[PDB]
């Protein structure tokens, strides 16, 4: 009679690497590396992302006429730019501190747009209707940004304007405006009458004065002129004051911002779909409890640690020897 000691083996083909040998077959193991995704863009916390499409952040917030789909947008879980987000500033010029603005936005989860200076009642002494350009066509007509108002001379005069806004929305307000720089002195006169015009803007934190830089530059979208775009976050209770004797592209709509965490801007050409996920990447969503992923370093939500590895399988059972 006899008794023997022994250990389990099975038909398992799982292999793992160890420090002394590679490609070792074991009886059980666990994969620690998620390497699969669903190729779509999904909701998070059940909120759909904002797909900007052909517009970019600048084009969105100014209301480039090419961006009318975005006019109704108010909450999103994150923001998606694509390879074709080319509609931004349609009138050529610099958008000042643009990268910082995007950063601010990476932590805004929703907002309420509102009419800061109603076109019809705020500007009784200035022209509000000739401020369109072939540079911002829409339906083949000269048109303009939906969130800004281009003021020009009435008859043959541009009197000094002074307009202030007090923030009673209970949260930060994003205010955008522009400063126009005609290419010639005679053009300056045609639009604003005054050669020595300036724009001054002030609140508790922002305080800047701008003057027109008139000069010939190469034409961009047919325009030898330029327009600069500026923005500020008006703190609760704060006031913003605009003063100008010309060249001001005044705010029309502004944005009361709701802050969140875990929001962000991603760039992806993957289709948005109605699925829901806890972790989103630019290639597609991940539905995983694995500690690691090698899908993408950019993630929104709660995700596995990104690593370059192609394989992380930890043996749990023993060397498999049938």
């Amino acid at each position: 009679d006899t008794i023997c000691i022994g250990y389990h083996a099975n038909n398992s083909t799982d292999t793992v690497d160890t420090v002394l040998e590679k490609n070792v077959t074991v009886t059980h193991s666990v994969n620690l590396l998620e390497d699969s995704h669903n190729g779509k863009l999904c909701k998070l916390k059940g909120i759909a992302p904002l797909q900007l499409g052909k517009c970019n952040i600048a084009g969105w917030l100014l209301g480039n006429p090419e961006c009318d789909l975005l006019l109704t947008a108010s909450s999103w879980s994150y923001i998606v730019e694509t390879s074709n987000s080319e509609n931004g500033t349609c009138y050529p010029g610099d958008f000042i501190d643009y990268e910082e603005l995007r950063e601010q936005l990476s932590s805004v989860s929703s907002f309420e747009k509102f009419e800061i200076f109603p076109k019809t009642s705020s500007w009784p002494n200035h022209e509000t209707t000739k401020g369109v350009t072939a540079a911002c066509s829409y339906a083949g007509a000269s048109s303009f940004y939906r969130n800004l108002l281009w003021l020009t001379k009435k008859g043959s005069s541009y009197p000094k304007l002074s307009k202030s806004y007090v923030n009673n929305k209970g949260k930060e307000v994003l205010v955008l405006w522009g400063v126009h720089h005609p290419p010639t002195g005679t053009d300056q006169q045609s639009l604003y009458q005054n050669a020595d015009a300036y724009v001054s803007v002030g609140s508790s934190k922002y305080n800047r004065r701008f003057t027109p830089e008139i000069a010939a530059r190469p034409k961009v979208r047919d325009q030898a002129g330029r327009m600069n775009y500026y923005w500020t976050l008006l703190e609760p209770g704060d006031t913003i004051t605009f003063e100008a004797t010309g060249n001001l592209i005044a705010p029309w709509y502004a944005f009361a911002l709701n802050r969140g965490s875990g929001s962000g801007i991603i760039t992806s050409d993957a289709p948005v779909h109605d699925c829901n996920t806890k972790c989103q990447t630019p290639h597609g969503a991940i539905n995983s409890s694995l500690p690691f992923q090698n899908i993408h370093p950019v993630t929104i939500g709660e995700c596995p640690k990104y690593v370059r590895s192609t394989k992380l399988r930890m043996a749990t059972g023993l060397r498999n020897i049938p």
Binding site: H28, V30, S289, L290, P291, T316
Partner: protein
Amino acid sequence: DGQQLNRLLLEWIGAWDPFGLGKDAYDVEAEAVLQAVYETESAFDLAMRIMWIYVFAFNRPIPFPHAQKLARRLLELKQAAS
């Protein structure tokens, strides 16, 4: 058929409730256990899958014998309907 067997197996997995979270807190993990069930006939392999399933989801080790008990009921039930 599976439609009915699937609904029952899932109800049970939730009811196991190893962490006192309520039967509805384990819906994700329960599907993973159901899937794993159709992939084997060995109570031991299955007992191992479950424990792993629940350790990733919850960062908490389930007593082996407790897990092992659940697996036995499920494979008995799989065979009983098949």
